[PDB]
Amino acid sequence: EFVKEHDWKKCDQSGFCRRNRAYADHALSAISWESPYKIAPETGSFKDGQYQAIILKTINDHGETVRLPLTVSFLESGTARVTIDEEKRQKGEIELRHDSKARKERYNEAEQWVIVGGMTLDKGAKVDYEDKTQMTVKYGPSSKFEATIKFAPFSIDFKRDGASHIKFNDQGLLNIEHWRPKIDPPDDSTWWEESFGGNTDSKPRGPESVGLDISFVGYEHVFGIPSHASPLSLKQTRGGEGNYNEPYRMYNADVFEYILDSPMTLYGSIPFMQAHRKDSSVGIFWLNAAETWVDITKGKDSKNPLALGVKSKITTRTHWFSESGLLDVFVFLGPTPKDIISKYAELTGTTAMPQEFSLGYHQCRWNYVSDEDVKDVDRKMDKFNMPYDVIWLDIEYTDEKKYFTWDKHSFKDPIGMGKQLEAHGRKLVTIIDPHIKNTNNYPVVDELKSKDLAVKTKDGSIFEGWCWPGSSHWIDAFNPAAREWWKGLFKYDKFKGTMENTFIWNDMNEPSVFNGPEVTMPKDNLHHGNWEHRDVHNLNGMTFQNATYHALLSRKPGEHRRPFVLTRAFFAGSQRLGAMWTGDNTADWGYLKASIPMVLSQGIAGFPFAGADVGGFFGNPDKDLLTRWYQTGIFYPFFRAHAHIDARRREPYLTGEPYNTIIAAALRLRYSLLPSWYTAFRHAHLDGTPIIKPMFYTHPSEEAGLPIDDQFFIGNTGLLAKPVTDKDRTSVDIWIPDSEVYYDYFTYDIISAAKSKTATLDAPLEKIPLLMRGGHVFARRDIPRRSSALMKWDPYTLVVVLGNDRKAEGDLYVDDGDSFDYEKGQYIHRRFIFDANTLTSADYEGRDDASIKEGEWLKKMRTVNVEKIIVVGAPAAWKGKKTVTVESEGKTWAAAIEYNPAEKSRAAFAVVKKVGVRVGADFKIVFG
């Protein structure tokens, strides 16, 4: 690898970060500090759910002002939006330095990239009160939400249920760096050119950062702003025991050997933060694509947060600042975590419906070295009864790092390789990165250049820099023409050697530039639209994944199907485009433990299709670590093993016994649960529901769960997992969230009942700690197969998990896994309800059976049954009854049931075999 010893800006080395931190330091120590920003009330108007006014910023002691247009929107969802722009820049009345052609306006296209819905203004929103000092707007459901806008100094307080929850500018940290010329006196050391990492940023606009304090009143825990190697409940950043000293950073970057427990940026950024306490949740989304830092402190509400004489109630103070663009913030008032995330997903998108196969196990390393290597691994997995769906090719498959080629010495017959995988319904994934080799006899680069599709430098020249191919240029995927060109390259008849089972991995899309500052592009590079790279950096990865997503919709005439694209770099909205992973982690126990809070943070930030490299990327995991890593990785929504080029081969059949058997058992569990995993992805698609769910989300009334980040619920199943992530551990302490009954998934032992507590569970190497909560039904497929495709027509088992209510609910969603026919109703979605000794299956959306004409997939599913029902926590009244009564599609019959009484701590349970009811039809089964 090119960079041996990396240089990352600390906050003091980022000019605008230094300035905003210093602004805070001044404001928070000034006596009677007043923010020098005022609404000019006579400029204000409220109409049809929107307030518009001019904020005047006082810029010097002579009282000179600049005009900053304010827009506050009250949306039908109950979300509010606050936007501040700069009028002189809107009017183009500034002069860029260096004869730069960069845009004069503040970047205002983040919305175009990110926002897909939820923007309808609430015409029911109304001014409840105003005078010459303030105005209050009521909005939200039944007018329950209020925003009080104070004019002088400017502030906004967002209220519900008789209190303030979120305050803007309470601490007076609002900072919009207005345009100024470079003039000498008649601290500006960071205003103009800045050098770092072997590069000087020409900085043609000068200072232009935007920042604000956002206070979460009475909240002690905040969450989100992935991606960081950090706890789910974010740390403070201004010092203290256990805390950081630097703000959280979002500046998508290629961070070689990234460390644990750090606010340093990683590869992707979602500037979305929630605050949660018992029975109250709120949140903000900072819609800004530039380099962004977030400071976090917690204490009392007093100016000295450690003062005596004041109420103890904690407020979390957050200080957001971005290098350029608009101040543009959405405010969510909940009141539950589910509400907040659903509203966020309405704005930025829900999870795309995945390729079904992509929930399977993915086998990868850097590299499989030939087509024969690939075919041998495929055979070996089958010899060792280790199911898997996809094999991956990293960068060594290419001809000298030219994308859209194959190394013909080593990959002689890629179609034959593709066809072998197809015999088990398996897939191939091939890497394609955004750097295009600058060399002769390569039509891809010729077209990139002649069509003007490459990112440019500060002066309009084509950008050149180094990555895997050596000297390279970069696709500018902000350009719609570049995205349309890119589509053409993926057609099966153009990208030779690919076929219908070939999908794509996008990497190095931060962009990673080996000889660039912080391994990325200069900030004064120019993109399509004449935006500076500084304006759009955090969107770059997403634009590239977008290009590839749309290339995979159709690669031959008549084809229309779901993409699968893995990305490294990402932004808000990337959930619409495919999966991510957490990049170059390390083969050590601390990274295994860290993976779970990271993957959880992804899902609560609205991008749940996430995972970490199983085994760790860098290094050689011990056999026990690798084994535990499989047991955790089967709970990542995106489940792939991967290894760095210097790591030994560690395909799972190489581990040896007893590890092989334990790893195979983990794989078999993932596969058996695939019906429930796919259903969980369906809910993520319907309304942004996370796929794996932290305690704050499932149990908003249970304060003790707030920071817990090492256990989680799966989908809609009530399954509670706590993988072992510590070396040589042979037990685990699980926090039981509530008073329901919890059962061991494998033995049906009663682990807890009647009261929230910590329960200690045996957990040797061969144990996956997995509990079933009472009140839930979930589906699985018990028959083991070699791949998910080979399970498509197999019968289902339903597990009905009862607590003392003897009542439960769950669901199952199935479709063809590939097309967009789901949009026209071609799917099965069952709601299963157990109540009063009866299990029923109904269509989840209450559709009439002959409101939909059955396509080919639905017709084939007529042969697919629910065949087995297990009831855990079976009532004693059922003892000695040998049948249940089954009714379906007009027919009634008896099915045999076996009742097993409680024994020691093992629950009573009953099993119905050979139920024989088609999964697509209503049924009613009466027990007892």
Ligand X SMILES: OC[C@H]1NC[C@H](O)[C@@H](O)[C@@H]1O
Summarize as ranges the residues that interact with ligand X (CB under 6 A).
366, 394-395, 507, 568, 583-584, 642
Catalytic residue, chosen from 220, 510, 518, 651, is 510
Question: In the structure encoding, which two tokens stand for residue 733, read together?
Answer: 């302490």
Q: Which is nearer to ligand X, 418 or 583 (CB)?
A: 583
Q: Which is nearer to ligand X, 220 or 507 (CB)?
A: 507
Question: In the structure encoding, which two tokens stand for residue 851, read together?
Answer: 């409101």
Catalytic residue, chosen from 507, 740, 816, 867, is 507
Between CA 570 and CA 227 the distance in angstroms is 9
Segment holding 503, helix H or strand E = strand 502-506
Rg for the chain (alpha carbons), in Å?
Answer: 28
Between CA 264 and CA 251 the distance in angstroms is 9
Answer yes or no: 399 catalytic: no
The least CB distance from residue 2 to ligand X, in Å, is: 11
Q: Which is nearer to ligand X, 266 or 341 (CB)?
A: 266
Q: Which is nearer to ligand X, 509 or 632 (CB)?
A: 509
Q: Which is nearer to ligand X, 431 or 917 (CB)?
A: 431
The least CB distance from residue 228 to ligand X, in Å, is: 17
| Residue found under tokens 């045999």 | 896
Contact of 317 with 298, CB cutoff 8 Å: yes
> Under DSSP, is residue 98 helix (H, G, I), strand (E, B) or coil?
helix
| Residue found under tokens 């349970």 | 909
The least CB distance from residue 669 to ligand X, in Å, is: 26
The least CB distance from residue 588 to ligand X, in Å, is: 17
The least CB distance from residue 502 to ligand X, in Å, is: 17
> In this structure, how many other beta carbons lie within 10 angstroms of the beta carbon of residue 47?
9
The least CB distance from residue 62 to ligand X, in Å, is: 53
Looking at 583-657, list the stretches that DSSP marks H as alpha helix, in order from N- to C-terminal side: 589-604, 623-633
Between CA 272 and CA 405 the distance in angstroms is 39
Q: Which is nearer to ligand X, 244 or 397 (CB)?
A: 397
Between CA 883 and CA 893 the distance in angstroms is 10
Answer yes or no: 447 catalytic: no
Q: Which is nearer to ligand X, 568 or 722 (CB)?
A: 568
Segment holding 37, helix H or strand E = strand 37-39
Among 926, 913, 914, residue whose Cα is nearest residue 835: 926
The least CB distance from residue 392 to ligand X, in Å, is: 9
The amino acid that residue 607 corresponds to is F
Q: Which is nearer to ligand X, 72 or 395 (CB)?
A: 395
The least CB distance from residue 587 to ligand X, in Å, is: 13
> Under DSSP, is residue 416 helix (H, G, I), strand (E, B) or coil?
helix
- DSSP label at 574? G
The least CB distance from residue 395 to ligand X, in Å, is: 4
Looking at 760-904, list the stretches that DSSP marks H as alpha helix, in order from N- to C-terminal side: 856-861
- Give the Å distances, CA to CA, from 274 to 72, 166, 210, 601, 823: 20, 11, 21, 11, 32
Q: Which is nearer to ligand X, 364 or 874 (CB)?
A: 364
Among 785, 774, 845, residue whose Cα is nearest residue 813: 845
Q: How, if at all, do strands 427-431 and 838-843 pair?
A: unpaired
Phi, psi of 130 (to 5 degrees): -150, 155
Beta bridge partners of 143: none
Answer yes or no: 584 catalytic: yes
Between CA 293 and CA 16 the distance in angstroms is 10
Catalytic residue, chosen from 584, 811, 816, 867, is 584
| Residue found under tokens 């649960």 | 673
Residue whose Cβ sits closest to ligand X: 366
Q: Which residues are catalytic?
A: 507, 510, 584
